DNA sequence: GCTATGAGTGGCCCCTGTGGAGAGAAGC
DNA sequence: GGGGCCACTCATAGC
RNA sequence: GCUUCUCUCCACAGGUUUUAGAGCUAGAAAUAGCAAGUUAAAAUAAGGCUAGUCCGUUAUCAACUUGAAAAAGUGGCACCGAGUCGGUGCUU
């Protein structure tokens, strides 16, 4: 007899709770065997559970960091160009100029020329750096001299202007010596440019050089009153680079504001620190030069300086005169933001279309990429395709033949009553056509009083007409076709089919761009047919929004049967006159054979498919897929006999369209054999609830939740779900609400940790100073962290158990030990392509291969007294076991925690505080119960002891104080990482379990999705010491 | 008797701000 | 939020 | 007309690390005084081959067997009880 049941299902952010009930409302128990090489060779079960997984992320972060990879891949291109350019005039200047500007990151030790790299020399670095304090000096020098410089520094300054060269907001030549346009650059300069009084073309460097001789004025008038007025405090500000002063300011991490902020009170107890004060109001004291604020300098004031230098030293290098404007249009240059990424097909992201196979320079840019075909492909790409043809594309929403559509879609079903007609009749092709000529192409709307006035009545001679299906006027007009007579002015040129495609592909340039040079470009095909003044009419002229069918849907396939189109159909049809919907619907005509065949029935879908195109959070998603799976093993368990019913909710992201697709997958999944007349058999009732109706079932029958005790709550939420919706559908208080209860209390429930390799970055992106530990990890292959410095904390995929033999002490003696060693997610593809040579580098000897066994993270291990531990890494272990608190315990907490905030009738609230008050004994068994599991499986007796104190010294506090903070108590036994958390007014540390050499000794689980099925590994058996 | 270790406790640590442009779906 | 690192400090195994 | 899922591209400013910007005086040193302090180069996840002015942090992942992978297969029931689950009867 196979047994009748339905299985329940919660939808998190978080977790997916799973549960399976008959038609009595238990949940059944069945015995699992055990695989492995234990003696426990089977478990008995509660058919229920949830699964706890970490939260899905999208890949913004990761689109982050790949623009910011491919910004810094171009800068550098730039400065390689830079380079090429000048470097066969350089290697007649100095050859190792290049050499030194390379390597200069590496200490004395590991430079392969002199250690100085703009002249290698002391004594002409001195007069560089005194001659040019800073970078802006060398700049201003540039643009006014008019000697003849020396070739390395005008290569640093082109250089530190392209690797800075400003944003690109303002688009256009704008006028630096700067109605509203002229306001905005005055008002935008002055704020970059303050009171730029001397004439000069580099106003930026002028103003630059000014900050820094008021810096250096206002840092002298500080020295001098501090040393004069407060001798104590000179060395704290200005030596103590702890602090937030000067020191720290400069030498150390300080920023602008807490400097200002650590200063603000010294000035005010010194005297003449009046001026001081002003500039501290205006953010001017002692202002750095490499500035945040400098991010609003337009790059049109970098190109002017470039200009200039380029101008001014052009005479003394003939190179630079041939090469202008190629230095000019390398600063100028940006990939257009609709073009992409260069790629050569090899990436998923690119688009371009590439007409010829040289390499692409910012030189060539426009000869060899296709501007119009780039952007025509960039909107194309993940726009919204056809739903009856998935692979077409639809038309824009103002296109001709849409409209042409929509029209003879509507006069369709159009019927007229005259005198002498005992039935309302369709209109013939003709009369369409005629009705579309006279009225659809003379008035942009087009009403029933109008036809009756202008069709009827004048060309067909009926004095009373009747109109049906038109509420007072068409919907479907021609607007774009009168905008076409506007412009283009000639009927027949519009009416001749023949100019069919040349419009269409005019109204879709219309609808793509924005950009009227690119609709220039376009156009400029379509030039030869139309003069300079319709042309232009047209480029003023823009269109949005898509439309919902595709060309080759409407007007592209034909009946095999008459060759006619849907257009052509609807243009005339006789005395059938079918519309869209008949048409497509219609078994004579193989527009629905067409349809059949456009449709795609590829590998299982919801697997990825849905998965990565259903619209929500990547988070749901995953939940989705997990869901799904869980199922299906379930199913599995269950003989493969599918439940009959399956109720799911979807809990609201701390109506809804996903919960139908979701409905609809697992009817797919679920229901898939077809009845005779083609009809699917729906053995399976897929069953979508409201959290409103479970939560007032919990109050109203004191069966209380509460989430901070464990991570039964989604499980039983679950089990409600599914009670709820099969008690509901179906339509005994006595033994239901019994049956409820008891399963309420089952301390059984398998609650499983997704098991998850680690991905993400390498490392923290913190980089580090120099320190003698070898756990550092170097930027580069060739650079010793020691020297460099560089990143720390890795993260580690997972580890894998060593069983070898590895020498220790100074006589390198072979010592047999069993171990964990963690993987980094960096050293991934390396361990997994040969363990064996890449644990030989590590050191380890005599490596035993068949003992290696994968331990991702959250792998399971057991301890005795039923004591488990979750490895959270190869060095820490998390908290693996939940707190079985009995039901009663929880009612009362959630009474006591909502006594002043009860929501219900006085009766009810009184019986409820007064039940409260008889139990209040029940503090004292929680708290023995909280100690008695923190014993048997925490082991934290320094916490533990202060916890005890503390709840000895507050017992004569109010309840409702006491339940919020025993509440609060529960964070020393949830699962996963221990938490601090306050008692009343006491700080508790987090108990950190910092040692893993006891797991292996334990007892290896694993747990499939939901557990059910377990495999024991004893590592203690292997390689015995 | 000396040293490596390793086991435990307590406390600090983690890259940030902005701009431009381009289809839908779900809801006000 | 949670894991990695450092700094003391003492218990204990190995020489 | 406004919010979000986008999710992709183009962009800027920072920030971090090492090196360079000769510290001086008295003192053997510890140290005391003095002076200066604003900038620059390079990298910005290890690197990989398909060698691109491309790609590298989203999504996917219990164990055993077959498969490059995808993919597929691998685990009795019933009853009575319930502190992380136990006992009883048939069968293979």
Known sequence: MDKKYSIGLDIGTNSVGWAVITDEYKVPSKKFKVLGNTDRHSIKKNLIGALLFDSGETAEATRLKRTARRRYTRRKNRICYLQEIFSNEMAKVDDSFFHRLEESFLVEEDKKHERHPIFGNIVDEVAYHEKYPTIYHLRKKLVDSTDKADLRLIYLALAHMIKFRGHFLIEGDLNPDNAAKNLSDAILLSDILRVNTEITKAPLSASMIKRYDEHHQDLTLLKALVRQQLPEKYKEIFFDQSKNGYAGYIDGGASQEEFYKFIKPILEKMDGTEELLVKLNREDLLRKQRTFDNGSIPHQIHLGELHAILRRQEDFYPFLKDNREKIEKILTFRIPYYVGPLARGNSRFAWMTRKSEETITPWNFEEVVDKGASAQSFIERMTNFDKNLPNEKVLPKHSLLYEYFTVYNELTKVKYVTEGMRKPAFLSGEQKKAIVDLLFKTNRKVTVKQLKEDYFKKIECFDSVEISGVEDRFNASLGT??????????????????????????????????????????????????????????????????????????????????????????????????????????????????????????????????????????????????????????????????????????????????????????????????????????????????????????????????????????????????????????KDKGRDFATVRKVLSMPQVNIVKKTEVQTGGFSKESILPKRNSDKLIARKKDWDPKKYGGFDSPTVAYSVLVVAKVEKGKSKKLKSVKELLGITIMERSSFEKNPIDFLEAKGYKEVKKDLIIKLPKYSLFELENGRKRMLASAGELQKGNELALPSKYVNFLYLASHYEKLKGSPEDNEQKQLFVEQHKHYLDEIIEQISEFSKRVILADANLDKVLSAYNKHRDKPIREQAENIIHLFTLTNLGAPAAFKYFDTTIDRKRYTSTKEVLDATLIHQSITGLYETRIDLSQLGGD
């Open 481 to 730: 076709y009168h905008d076409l007579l506007k412009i283009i002015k000639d009927k027949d040129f519009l009416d001749n089919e023949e100019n069919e495609d040349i419009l269409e592909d005019i109204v879709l340039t219309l609808t793509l761009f924005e950009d009227r040079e690119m609709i220039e470009e376009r156009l400029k095909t379509y030039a030869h047919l139309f003069d300079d003044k319709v042309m232009k009419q047209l480029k003023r002229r823009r269109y949005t929004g898509w439309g919902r069918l595709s060309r080759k849907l409407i007007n592209g396939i034909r009946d095999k049967q008459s060759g006619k189109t849907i257009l052509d159909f609807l243009k005339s049809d006789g005395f059938a006159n079918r519309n869209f919907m008949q048409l497509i619907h219609d078994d004579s005509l193989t527009f629905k054979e067409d349809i059949q065949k456009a449709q795609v029935s590829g590998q299982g879908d919801s697997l990825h498919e849905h998965i990565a195109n259903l619209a929500g959070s990547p988070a749901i998603k995953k939940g989705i897929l997990q869901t799904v799976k869980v199922v299906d093993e379930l199913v599995k368990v269950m003989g493969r006999h599918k439940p009959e019913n399956i109720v799911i909710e979807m809990a609201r992201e701390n109506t809804r369209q996903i919960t139908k697709h979701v409905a609809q997958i697992l009817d797919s999944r679920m229901n898939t054999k077809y009845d005779e007349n083609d009809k699917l058999i729906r053995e399976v009732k897929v069953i979508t609830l409201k959290s409103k109706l479970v939560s007032d079932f919990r109050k109203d029958f004191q069966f209380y939740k509460v989430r901070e005790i464990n991570n039964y709550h989604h499980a039983h939420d679950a089990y409600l779900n599914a009670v709820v919706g099969t008690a509901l559908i179906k």
